[PDB]
Amino acid sequence: GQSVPWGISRVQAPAAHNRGLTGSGVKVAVLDTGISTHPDLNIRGGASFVPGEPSTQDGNGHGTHVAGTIAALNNSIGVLGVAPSAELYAVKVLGADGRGAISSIAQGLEWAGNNGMHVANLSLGSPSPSATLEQAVNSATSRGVLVVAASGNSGASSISYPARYANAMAVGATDQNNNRASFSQYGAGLDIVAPGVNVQSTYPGSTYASLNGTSMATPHVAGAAALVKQKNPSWSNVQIRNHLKNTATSLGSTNLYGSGLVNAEAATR
Numbered sequence: 084g085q086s087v088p089w090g091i092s093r094v095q096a097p098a099a100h101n102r103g104l105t106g107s108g109v110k111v112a113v114l115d116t117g118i119s120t121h122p123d124l125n126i127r128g129g130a131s132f133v134p135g136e137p138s139t140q141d142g143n144g145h146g147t148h149v150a151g152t153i154a155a156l157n158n159s160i161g162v163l164g165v166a167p168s169a170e171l172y173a174v175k176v177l178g179a180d181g182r183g184a185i186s187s188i189a190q191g192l193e194w195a196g197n198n199g200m201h202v203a204n205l206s207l208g209s210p211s212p213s214a215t216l217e218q219a220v221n222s223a224t225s226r227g228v229l230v231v232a233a234s235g236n237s238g239a240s241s242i243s244y245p246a247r248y249a250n251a252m253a254v255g256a257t258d259q260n261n262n263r264a265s266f267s268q269y270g271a272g273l274d275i276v277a278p279g280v281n282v283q284s285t286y287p288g289s290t291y292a293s294l295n296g297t298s299m300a301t302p303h304v305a306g307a308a309a310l311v312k313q314k315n316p317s318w319s320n321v322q323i324r325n326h327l328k329n330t331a332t333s334l335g336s337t338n339l340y341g342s343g344l345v346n347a348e349a350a351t352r
């Protein structure tokens with residue numbers, strides 16, 4: 084039997100799938116700990132930039148769970164992602180320990196732009212800026228990639244990098260009451276928010292697990308971006324980003340929430 088996680092229903096992704104918008108023909112790169120083979124996922128390819136781990140398989144769990152919020156398959160098992168027909172690419176930039184070097188994330192972003200990805204999901208972040216990282220964000224953006232990044236989980240009133248950079252779309256986390264989750268970083272540069280508490284998705288060992296974090300909010304927006312691109316295939320990364328903000332539901336403070344809650348129904352109208 085298949086279960087629809089509350090967050091998927093909260094961003095109104097079934098209303099888009101009822102219009103025939105599933106993410107088909109949109110390439111989405113998940114720059115994370117890898118993606119493990121799973122019955123409710125279809126991985127099309129990828130690359131690893133982690134020296135001790137030449138495989139794209141996930142030794143952690145985090146990248147698999149991210150991948151499932153974006154694109155868990157629409158069938159009779161497991162769960163359902165926002166864009167269940169997106170072409171999923173596993174770009175391992177972080178190791179089995181969740182740790183990763185900035186050089187690894189920056190070549191992940193160069194691979195994305197070199198391989199014609201439409202959206203790159205970075206559910207990772209640092210409180211410090213990096214020249215290397217910002218240059219990689221900018222080069223993937225000028226190669227048409229929409230870079231979507233987590234605001235961070237420290238609860239502080241300023242957001243992490245790369246989300247703070249102008250060319251990355253910054254995503255915060257909400258709870259089931261549409262309040263800011265207490266860990267969700269906010270402040271200048273935050274663009275939008277999405278569900279990030281008690282998020283059920285695909286996990287290694289052909290199972291399902293619940294996690295909390297702005298890392299779980301980010302894939303809801305990466306997926307909504309794939310829905311808008313299949314609907315509007317000529318739109319650029321900036322057009323898609325502004326539309327998602329223009330159609331988001333206001334939740335209060337632009338300081339806390341940016342444009343508000345992503346809404347895949349209103350975005351594919």
Ligand SMILES: [Ca+2]
Pocket residue numbers: 085123155156157158159160161162163
């Ligand atoms: Ca499924």
Ligand SMILES: [Ca+2]
Pocket residue numbers: 245246247248249250251252253272
């Ligand atoms: Ca930004």
